[PDB]
């Protein structure tokens, strides 16, 4: 009853991380891999960083969690071409994410 949010968030983040379309998002994009990524994307985010944030008790509300995870998708979509494998992954996983958020009644 106290630590309810933490539990729900952890379950959701784990399901997202195990999803077969999560692989592009598991770790920070490297500048060496992506020319001018960090010029274009000002608030980078990824699921390893979110795991850390969660463990660090940063996600004190649904909204903070939802914003970080939404940003993972919107970074990817802005940066990559629309028919790229990363873009396809991003919308697949975003669909999955919204279905789990609704499924847990996460209200913000
Ligand atoms: C979400 N990822 C990207 O927008 C990305 C863009 C350009 C180059 C690499 C990228 O991320 C890699 C991070 C490590 O796994 C493979 C994708």
Curated annotation (Swiss-Prot):
Domain Bromo: 1-104
Superkingdom per UniProt: Eukaryota
Location(s), subcellular: Nucleus; Cytoplasm, Cytoskeleton, Microtubule organizing center, Centrosome; Cytoplasm
Expression by tissue: Ubiquitously expressed but most abundant in heart and skeletal muscle. Also expressed in the skin, in keratinocytes (at protein level).
Subunit architecture: Interacts with SIRT1. Interacts (unsumoylated form) with NR2C1; the interaction promotes transactivation activity. Interacts with EP300, CREBBP and DDX17. Interacts with NCOA1 and NCOA3. Component of a large chromatin remodeling complex, at least composed of MYSM1, KAT2B/PCAF, RBM10 and KIF11/TRIP5. Interacts with NR2C2 (hypophosphorylated and unsumoylated form); the interaction promotes the transactivation activity of NR2C2. Interacts with KLF1; the interaction does not acetylate KLF1 and there is no enhancement of its transactivational activity. Interacts with NFE4. Interacts with MECOM. (Microbial infection) Interacts with and acetylates HIV-1 Tat.
Function: Functions as a histone acetyltransferase (HAT) to promote transcriptional activation. Has significant histone acetyltransferase activity with core histones (H3 and H4), and also with nucleosome core particles. Has a a strong preference for acetylation of H3 at 'Lys-9' (H3K9ac). Also acetylates non-histone proteins, such as ACLY, MAPRE1/EB1, PLK4, RRP9/U3-55K and TBX5. Inhibits cell-cycle progression and counteracts the mitogenic activity of the adenoviral oncoprotein E1A.
Disorder this protein is connected to according to its UniProt record: Defects in KAT2B has been found in a patient with isolated coloboma, a defect of the eye characterized by the absence of ocular structures due to abnormal morphogenesis of the optic cup and stalk, and the fusion of the fetal fissure (optic fissure). Isolated colobomas may be associated with an abnormally small eye (microphthalmia) or small cornea.
Family the UniProt entry places it in: Belongs to the acetyltransferase family. GCN5 subfamily.
Domain note: (Microbial infection) The bromodomain mediates binding to HIV-1 Tat.
The protein's name in its UniProt record: Histone acetyltransferase KAT2B
The species this protein was found in: Homo sapiens (Human)
